[PDB]
Enzyme design. Structure first.
Site, PDB file in Angstrom:
ATOM      1  N   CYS A 295       0.809  -1.250   0.000  1.00  0.00           N
ATOM      2  CA  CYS A 295       0.000   0.000   0.000  1.00  0.00           C
ATOM      3  C   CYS A 295       0.834   1.288   0.000  1.00  0.00           C
ATOM      4  O   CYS A 295       1.583   1.595   0.958  1.00  0.00           O
ATOM      5  CB  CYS A 295      -1.012   0.036   1.161  1.00  0.00           C
ATOM      6  SG  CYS A 295      -2.105   1.508   1.130  1.00  0.00           S
TER       7      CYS A 295
ATOM      8  N   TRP B 193      -9.217   5.929  -1.091  1.00  0.00           N
ATOM      9  CA  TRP B 193      -9.556   6.600  -2.347  1.00  0.00           C
ATOM     10  C   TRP B 193      -8.566   6.198  -3.466  1.00  0.00           C
ATOM     11  O   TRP B 193      -7.504   5.632  -3.201  1.00  0.00           O
ATOM     12  CB  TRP B 193      -9.636   8.117  -2.169  1.00  0.00           C
ATOM     13  CG  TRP B 193      -8.437   8.763  -1.503  1.00  0.00           C
ATOM     14  CD1 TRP B 193      -7.240   9.090  -2.101  1.00  0.00           C
ATOM     15  CD2 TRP B 193      -8.322   9.177  -0.126  1.00  0.00           C
ATOM     16  NE1 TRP B 193      -6.391   9.671  -1.176  1.00  0.00           N
ATOM     17  CE2 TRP B 193      -7.028   9.741   0.038  1.00  0.00           C
ATOM     18  CE3 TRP B 193      -9.186   9.126   0.985  1.00  0.00           C
ATOM     19  CZ2 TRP B 193      -6.575  10.265   1.278  1.00  0.00           C
ATOM     20  CZ3 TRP B 193      -8.739   9.654   2.224  1.00  0.00           C
ATOM     21  CH2 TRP B 193      -7.445  10.222   2.348  1.00  0.00           C
TER      22      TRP B 193
HETATM   23  C1  HEM Z   1      -6.202   6.602   1.822  1.00  0.00           C
HETATM   24  C2  HEM Z   1      -6.029   6.286   0.530  1.00  0.00           C
HETATM   25  C3  HEM Z   1      -5.245   5.058   0.038  1.00  0.00           C
HETATM   26  C4  HEM Z   1      -4.508   5.018  -1.084  1.00  0.00           C
HETATM   27  C5  HEM Z   1      -4.214   6.171  -2.097  1.00  0.00           C
HETATM   28  C6  HEM Z   1      -3.964   3.675  -1.195  1.00  0.00           C
HETATM   29  C7  HEM Z   1      -3.166   3.247  -2.219  1.00  0.00           C
HETATM   30  C8  HEM Z   1      -3.047   1.942  -2.595  1.00  0.00           C
HETATM   31  C9  HEM Z   1      -2.778   1.429  -3.929  1.00  0.00           C
HETATM   32  C10 HEM Z   1      -2.589   2.260  -5.235  1.00  0.00           C
HETATM   33  C11 HEM Z   1      -2.705   0.105  -3.812  1.00  0.00           C
HETATM   34  C12 HEM Z   1      -2.465  -0.952  -4.908  1.00  0.00           C
HETATM   35  C13 HEM Z   1      -3.830  -1.119  -5.575  1.00  0.00           C
HETATM   36  C14 HEM Z   1      -3.702  -2.157  -6.647  1.00  0.00           C
HETATM   37  O1  HEM Z   1      -2.712  -2.160  -7.403  1.00  0.00           O
HETATM   38  O2  HEM Z   1      -4.618  -2.988  -6.761  1.00  0.00           O
HETATM   39  C15 HEM Z   1      -2.947  -0.256  -2.451  1.00  0.00           C
HETATM   40  C16 HEM Z   1      -2.944  -1.541  -1.984  1.00  0.00           C
HETATM   41  C17 HEM Z   1      -3.320  -1.893  -0.723  1.00  0.00           C
HETATM   42  N1  HEM Z   1      -3.764  -1.037   0.276  1.00  0.00           N
HETATM   43 FE1  HEM Z   1      -4.034   0.956   0.098  1.00  0.00          FE
HETATM   44  N2  HEM Z   1      -4.403   2.902  -0.126  1.00  0.00           N
HETATM   45  C18 HEM Z   1      -5.202   3.725   0.666  1.00  0.00           C
HETATM   46  C19 HEM Z   1      -5.887   3.308   1.793  1.00  0.00           C
HETATM   47  C20 HEM Z   1      -5.841   2.048   2.341  1.00  0.00           C
HETATM   48  C21 HEM Z   1      -6.578   1.553   3.471  1.00  0.00           C
HETATM   49  C22 HEM Z   1      -7.647   2.347   4.277  1.00  0.00           C
HETATM   50  C23 HEM Z   1      -6.172   0.303   3.678  1.00  0.00           C
HETATM   51  C24 HEM Z   1      -6.648  -0.679   4.755  1.00  0.00           C
HETATM   52  C25 HEM Z   1      -7.085  -0.215   5.929  1.00  0.00           C
HETATM   53  C26 HEM Z   1      -5.193  -0.046   2.694  1.00  0.00           C
HETATM   54  C27 HEM Z   1      -4.524  -1.260   2.580  1.00  0.00           C
HETATM   55  C28 HEM Z   1      -4.029  -1.786   1.427  1.00  0.00           C
HETATM   56  C29 HEM Z   1      -3.718  -3.190   1.214  1.00  0.00           C
HETATM   57  C30 HEM Z   1      -3.833  -4.405   2.189  1.00  0.00           C
HETATM   58  C31 HEM Z   1      -3.223  -3.253  -0.218  1.00  0.00           C
HETATM   59  C32 HEM Z   1      -2.760  -4.522  -1.001  1.00  0.00           C
HETATM   60  C33 HEM Z   1      -4.057  -5.001  -1.674  1.00  0.00           C
HETATM   61  C34 HEM Z   1      -3.815  -6.224  -2.501  1.00  0.00           C
HETATM   62  O3  HEM Z   1      -2.749  -6.871  -2.276  1.00  0.00           O
HETATM   63  O4  HEM Z   1      -4.688  -6.530  -3.380  1.00  0.00           O
HETATM   64  N3  HEM Z   1      -5.029   1.030   1.886  1.00  0.00           N
HETATM   65  N4  HEM Z   1      -3.129   0.886  -1.716  1.00  0.00           N
HETATM   66  C1  JM8 Z   2      -8.744  -0.655  -0.390  1.00  0.00           C
HETATM   67  C2  JM8 Z   2      -7.246  -0.672  -0.069  1.00  0.00           C
HETATM   68  S1  JM8 Z   2      -6.306   0.508  -1.016  1.00  0.00           S
HETATM   69  C3  JM8 Z   2      -7.410   1.903  -1.002  1.00  0.00           C
HETATM   70  C4  JM8 Z   2      -8.061   2.063  -2.349  1.00  0.00           C
HETATM   71  C5  JM8 Z   2      -7.282   2.015  -3.449  1.00  0.00           C
HETATM   72  N1  JM8 Z   2      -6.595   3.109  -3.774  1.00  0.00           N
HETATM   73  N2  JM8 Z   2      -7.210   0.876  -4.150  1.00  0.00           N
HETATM   74  C6  JM8 Z   2      -7.941  -0.366  -3.909  1.00  0.00           C
HETATM   75  C7  JM8 Z   2      -7.686  -1.250  -5.131  1.00  0.00           C
HETATM   76  C8  JM8 Z   2      -8.422  -0.674  -6.338  1.00  0.00           C
HETATM   77  C9  JM8 Z   2      -8.117  -1.480  -7.621  1.00  0.00           C
HETATM   78  N3  JM8 Z   2      -6.704  -1.403  -7.978  1.00  0.00           N
HETATM   79  C10 JM8 Z   2      -8.936  -0.883  -8.734  1.00  0.00           C
HETATM   80  O1  JM8 Z   2      -8.341  -0.307  -9.649  1.00  0.00           O
HETATM   81  O2  JM8 Z   2     -10.174  -0.946  -8.739  1.00  0.00           O
END
Ligand code: HEM
Ligand code: JM8
Ligand code: HEM
Ligand code: H4B
Ligand code: H4B
Ligand code: JM8
Ligand code: ZN
Lengths: 411, 407
Positions: free
Chosen positions: A108, A280
């Site tokens: 993340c 977001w």
């Molecule tokens: C506040 C705005 C946030 C932004 C801009 C952000 C950004 C991102 C992005 C760009 C990714 C990769 C998405 C992808 O390639 O599918 C990601 C992955 C992830 N984020 Fe965030 N995030 C945010 C909030 C959160 C929150 C609230 C959580 C959990 C409480 C979180 C936990 C995770 C986790 C566990 C992943 C890995 C997901 C996976 O492996 O499919 N993030 N984040």
């Molecule tokens: C919910 C944990 S990260 C916070 C939201 C986010 N920035 N990405 C969630 C994954 C979205 C996915 N890659 C998509 O393009 O729909």
């Protein structure tokens, strides 16, 4: 022991001690690196160590380590484990746990935000309709009319693994995909399989390019049930371009709220198999991946055709050129409608600052470079140039098998 | 012990057995992945020799043969007697080609078997080295129709008689700090330029001054030589639509030739072994031009394009990145200098991976370096899981020689 990482743009060297507190494994050995691999019922005996370790972390964070309150709570949890085989988190511990799982999420990039997280405690939930209600409130609160707010909703924990709460959707909001008899796909190809299950369960599909999927919800290990999110709760953004007036006629829109719903939250040895969370979007998730992967909406051709680029040779960089314009359109559209979004420049720069802060205050910041670096313009963002160390801390968000593969159907 | 890699774009799954022959160490543990880190005796020698000779004789379908057994003994006798041994030409060519084959950071390995090997083990002086290098430079350049090559200087002995090329590439531009405070030319080369100056070089103090070679023979003190200017093919950079682009005064060289690495074959160490191929466009247009710690030209280019630089969300850096990279490719094509774009190169590496899986049981690849520094997920390698491990023969990093050399 101390590990050092360097930024090759600034020569800033940082020193990681936090990796010392890691127990969980990576997939890597001294002989193989698996850093690019996507995916590389507990006893009392295993559980008390996990609980103790967690509560020790919790009580230190609040400056009460070794207090009577810390000791009593260890004893209280220990006794709970021996007699019921599990334990219940206090609300404070659940909140802290959830915040830390985010903090520890090495894939993340948005972690600068980890301390601002609304935690919805849904541990009193008992039915799929209850789950549905909890989820509508989350969407509503998180969306906040475009001014998005981070949130997580936590349904009851695993007990015997026969009574699991699960959200079968991978995201609360996602568009349907429909495989056609001629092999073409209508809508989002990533969701074809889940769409089929929904249809079989009895959803009536509109069969368009952007149909919001119904929620498929499993409570207490029972067969899951279908529910439609009220449309007025589903905020969406039509995609248009600031200079290209033909961009609107492509027919694109996307939803504003990304909410991952298929992951498992582990806190103190407890397993929360339904814990949807949302933040977001960073622009590239939509404009690069969702629109331009060959596996997804795959719009690169159409966009470059409308731009009349030279498409006969890859070396004109027509794909790269259309890619930037699409990404400009996404950011432009979200800003025009006042729906929170962040660009990959701003997000990665925020992440570097967060990361250095974490090194100072915490002794480290586990980070997966393969995932942190955006899928366009990699090296003009500062993360590309940043050495990272990936390791697994608890509390954590984990992957779990898709529920249609494991569910015992009741009928 | 057997491993799967998946392509998430195409769903093709591949099985890796080759990693079991993996010898060297990665830097990772079960607890910590160091995947994104840049730099993570007679007794020792015969196992290494044997392992290599075993693999050589297997490759010509003569494993276990008398010709196989006899060499093993010969080398064994040689080591016991001399404390080292000499490779046969055939072994040396095979070794070099395979170090390239095993280079986990190289996207261009589909070409691995078409390598011209220049045996410079008879070299004794820095002057000899200079001659060998000009000949390499001219053969590989080939008036723009570039040909892969390596030149191999004598192996390490006691380690007080190393051959080294002090330059990091045969051809690079100088870097000069100014009283002004800024940096003129290529900032990556400031320190090496200082070494040149203090060793005697008269610097022209311009933006694109081709460095001199600093060559060390037989563990002796390194010496200075200028590559004939007429053998250094360069390309002026223009854009097919932006007329003003040429006024930025940009040029780059045609021959990329890494000269600071160490070739290890059958336990023998070749510390001076410059090698060259041809450029992928992004290397110049993304990294060399746009890295903040390099020529750092994004800002100037964006001004000329009259983009809104008021806010990062306009993607003005991204727009200007594409154009810079368009200009590079177009400029090399117009002057007929081999170059490859990142689409075409990554497409080839995916086909090369399939061949290697089908024919060798695998292919070591470092995803972090293989994915291009622009437009990642629109190249097929982005979606391809890759396993990284270290096979021998190999190209290795080695300490910059000014930190080791005693004058
Ligand atoms: C506040 C705005 C946030 C932004 C801009 C952000 C950004 C991102 C992005 C760009 C990714 C990769 C998405 C992808 O390639 O599918 C990601 C992955 C992830 N984020 Fe965030 N995030 C945010 C909030 C959160 C929150 C609230 C959580 C959990 C409480 C979180 C936990 C995770 C986790 C566990 C992943 C890995 C997901 C996976 O492996 O499919 N993030 N984040
Ligand atoms: C919910 C944990 S990260 C916070 C939201 C986010 N920035 N990405 C969630 C994954 C979205 C996915 N890659 C998509 O393009 O729909
Ligand atoms: C023929 C065309 C070739 C292409 C298109 C190509 C492509 C590339 C690229 C893009 C890189 C990354 C370089 C960087 O980011 O600085 C690389 C690295 C590398 N290549 Fe190649 N290559 C070619 C030929 C060769 C040859 C002939 C050899 C050796 C005989 C070789 C061995 C290596 C090695 C050892 C690295 C890692 C160098 C380092 O760590 O800096 N390549 N290759
Ligand atoms: C094979 C490879 O690991 C896979 O494509 C990963 C690469 N990096 C990624 N990075 C992000 N942020 N999201 C992804 O889905 C992926 N996919
Ligand atoms: C820290 C990080 O490993 C570093 O920036 C890497 C990333 N990927 C790279 N990839 C290539 N081909 N060349 C490089 O110099 C780098 N630098
Ligand atoms: C020589 C072995 S790899 C084939 C040559 C090459 N394509 N690049 C070498 C690195 C050049 C450096 N990145 C630069 O941009 O100057
Ligand atoms: Zn690793």
């Amino acid at each position: 022991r101390f590990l050092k990482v360097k930024n090759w743009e600034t020569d800033v060297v940082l020193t990681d001690t936090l990796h010392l507190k890691s127990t969980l494994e990576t997939g890597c050995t001294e002989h193989i690196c698996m850093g690019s691999i996507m995916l590389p019922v507990r006893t009392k005996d295993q559980l008390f160590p996990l609980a103790k370790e967690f509560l020790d972390q919790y009580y230190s964070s609040i400056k009460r380590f070794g207090s009577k309150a810390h000791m009593d709570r260890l004893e209280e949890v220990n006794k709970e484990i021996e007699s019921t085989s599990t334990y219940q988190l206090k609300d404070t511990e659940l909140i802290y746990g959830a915040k830390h799982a985010w903090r520890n999420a090495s894939r993340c990039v948005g972690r600068i935000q980890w301390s601002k997280l609304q935690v919805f405690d849904a541990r009193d939930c008992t039915t799929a309709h209850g789950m549905f209600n909890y989820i509508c409130n989350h969407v509503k609160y998180a969306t906040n009319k475009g001014n998005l707010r981070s949130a997580i909703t936590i349904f009851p924990q695993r007990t015997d693994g026969k009574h699991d709460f699960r959200v079968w959707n991978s995201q609360l909001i996602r568009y349907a995909g429909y495989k056609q008899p001629d092999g073409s796909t209508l809508g989002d190809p990533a969701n074809v399989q889940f769409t089929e299950i929904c249809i079989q369960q009895g959803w009536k599909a509109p069969r368009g390019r952007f149909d919001v999927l119904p929620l498929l919800l499993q409570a207490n290990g029972n067969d899951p049930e279908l529910f439609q999110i009220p449309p007025e709760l589903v905020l969406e953004v039509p995609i248009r371009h600031p200079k290209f007036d033909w961009f609107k006629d492509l027919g694109l829109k996307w939803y504003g709220l990304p909410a991952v719903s298929n992951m498992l939250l582990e806190i103190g040895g407890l397993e929360f198999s339904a814990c949807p969370f949302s933040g977001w979007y960073m622009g590239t998730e939509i404009g690069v991946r969702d629109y331009c992967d060959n596996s997804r909406y795959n719009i690169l051709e159409e966009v470059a055709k409308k731009m009349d680029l030279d498409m006969r040779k890859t070396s004109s960089l027509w794909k790269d050129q259309a890619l930037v314009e699409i990404n400009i359109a996404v950011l432009y559209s979200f800003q025009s409608d006042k729906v929170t979004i962040v660009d990959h420049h701003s997000a990665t720069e925020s992440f570097i600052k967060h990361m250095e802060n974490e090194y100072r205050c915490r002794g480290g910041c586990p980070a997966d470079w393969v995932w942190i670096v955006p899928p366009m313009s990699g090296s003009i963002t500062p993360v590309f140039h940043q050495e990272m160390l990936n390791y697994r801390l608890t509390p954590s968000f984990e992957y779990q098998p898709d529920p249609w593969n494991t569910h015992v159907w009741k009928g």
